[PDB]
Design a protein around this ligand. Structure first.
Ligand SMILES: Nc1ncnc2c1ncn2[C@@H]1O[C@H](CSCC[C@H](N)C(=O)O)[C@@H](O)[C@H]1O
Length: 207
C-alpha cells in the first residue's frame, strides 16, 4: 500500500476509526479514479473534493465514520442515497453482499455506474432517481446511508428499514447533525452523533 494511502489510514485511525474492515475497504478503493485528473495529487488528502455537478466527493473520515455506524456485515443488504462519484458506493461494495444506490443527477449516476463496472464490482445496483423515496422494490434494508442532508428524516427511509435496520444520515439546514436511526420492533430510535455540513438532499425533480 502506497505512502499516501497509509498516511490517510493512519490519520483516520488517529481520528478514532476502529473498524479495520472499513479501513481495508478504504485502502482497496482507488480514490483517485473518482476525482478529475486535475485533483490527482490531492486524491488521498482527508478532504472533500469537487466532482461533477456542483457536488462533492465526501471527506474520507466522514465516509469511514458513516460506514462504521452502519455496522455492516457480508450479509447486509444496503441502500445508499446519493451515488455521486460512486466512491462511497465502491467502499460499501467491498463490505456487503449487495448495494443499491440512488442518484438524482443522471450525469453522475451514469459515470458512477461505469466506474463501478470498471472496478470489477458486480454487487451494485444503481438508479437515477429521488432518494427521498428510497427504493421500495428492493426493501427492506439492513442498512441505509444518505450522503446529502435533508431538513427532516425522510419517512420512506425509515419504512424501508428491516428489523434491526440502521439508517445513517445528516439532518438539518442551518444546524446539521449526523444521525443514526435504528428500527426496533414497533419503534425507531434516533441518536445524534456529531456536527456535519452536507449539500442538501434535493426533493423531486431529477437532474
Ligand atoms: N433526492 C436525492 N436523491 C438522490 N441523490 C441526491 C438527492 N439530492 C442530492 N443528491 C445527491 O447526493 C450527492 C451528494 S455528494 C455524495 C458523494 C458520494 N457519496 C460519493 O462518494 O461521491 C450528490 O451527488 C447529489 O446529486
Amino acid at each position: 500500500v502506497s505512502r499516501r494511502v497509509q498516511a490517510l489510514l493512519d490519520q483516520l485511525r488517529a481520528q478514532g476509526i476502529q473498524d479495520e474492515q472499513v479501513l481495508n475497504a478504504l485502502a482497496a478503493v482507488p480514490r483517485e479514479k473518482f476525482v478529475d485528473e486535475a485533483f490527482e495529487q490531492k486524491a488521498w488528502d482527508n478532504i472533500a473534493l469537487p466532482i461533477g455537478q456542483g457536488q462533492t466527493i465526501s471527506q474520507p473520515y466522514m465516509v469511514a465514520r458513516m460506514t462504521e455506524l452502519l455496522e455492516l456485515t457480508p450479509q447486509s443488504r444496503v441502500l445508499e442515497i446519493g451515488t455521486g462519484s460512486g466512491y462511497q458506493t465502491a467502499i460499501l461494495a467491498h463490505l456487503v453482499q449487495h448495494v443499491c444506490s440512488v442518484e438524482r443527477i443522471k450525469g453522475l449516476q451514469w459515470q458512477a455506474r461505469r466506474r463501478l463496472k470498471n472496478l470489477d464490482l458486480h454487487n451494485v445496483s444503481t438508479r437515477h432517481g429521488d432518494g427521498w423515496q428510497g427504493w421500495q422494490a428492493r426493501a427492506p434494508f439492513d442498512a441505509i446511508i444518505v450522503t446529502a442532508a435533508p431538513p427532516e428524516i425522510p419517512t420512506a427511509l425509515m419504512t424501508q428499514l428491516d428489523e434491526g435496520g440502521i439508517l445513517v444520515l445528516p439532518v438539518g439546514e442551518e444546524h446539521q447533525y449526523l444521525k443514526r436511526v435504528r428500527r426496533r420492533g414497533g419503534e425507531f430510535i434516533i441518536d445524534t452523533v456529531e456536527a456535519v455540513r452536507f449539500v442538501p438532499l434535493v426533493k423531486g425533480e431529477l437532474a
